[PDB]
Structure 1
Amino acid sequence: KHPVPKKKTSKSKRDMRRSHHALTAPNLTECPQCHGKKLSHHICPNCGYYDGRQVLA
């Protein structure tokens, strides 16, 4: 019992694990009603529109 790693990992080999840790940028879009900032199939957080006003802000 008790597996434990055998040699230390090289900086090269460990950094090439992390080859897949890249965050995906949000695909943002321009609110047609507010000024800008909006996430798709969601309300515009600033003005509250989702064709007219929804949420209070």
Structure 2
Amino acid sequence: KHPVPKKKTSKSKRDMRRSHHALTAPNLTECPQCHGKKLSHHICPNCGYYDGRQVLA
């Protein structure tokens, strides 16, 4: 029992591994009213608009 790594992993390796941790930036749209930005199919967090006006102020 008790596996353990045989050898330090190179800085190079370690970083090759990390080639996939890129965050994915939001696709962001600009609210058709109050004008800041929002997520598709969410309520625009600036005004509160989702066609008329749902969340409060």
Q: TM-score category by the smaller chain?
A: over 0.9
Moved over 6 A (4+): none
Corresponding residue SS for 1:19: coil
> Percent identity at matched positions?
100
Match of 1:28 in 2: 28
Q: Name whichever structure is richer in helix by fraction.
A: 1
Q: Unpaired segments of 5 or more residues in structure 2?
A: none
| Comparing 19-28 and 30-39, the one that deviates more | 30-39
Q: Deviations over 1:24-48 (max 9, x none)?
A: 0000001001112111100000100
The CA distance in 2 between the partners of 1:26 and 1:36, in whole Å, is: 14
- Report the TM-score when normalising by structure 2: 0.95
* Count, aligned residues: 57
Task: Please report the RMSD computed on the Cα atoms of aligned residues, expressed in angstroms.
Answer: 0.6
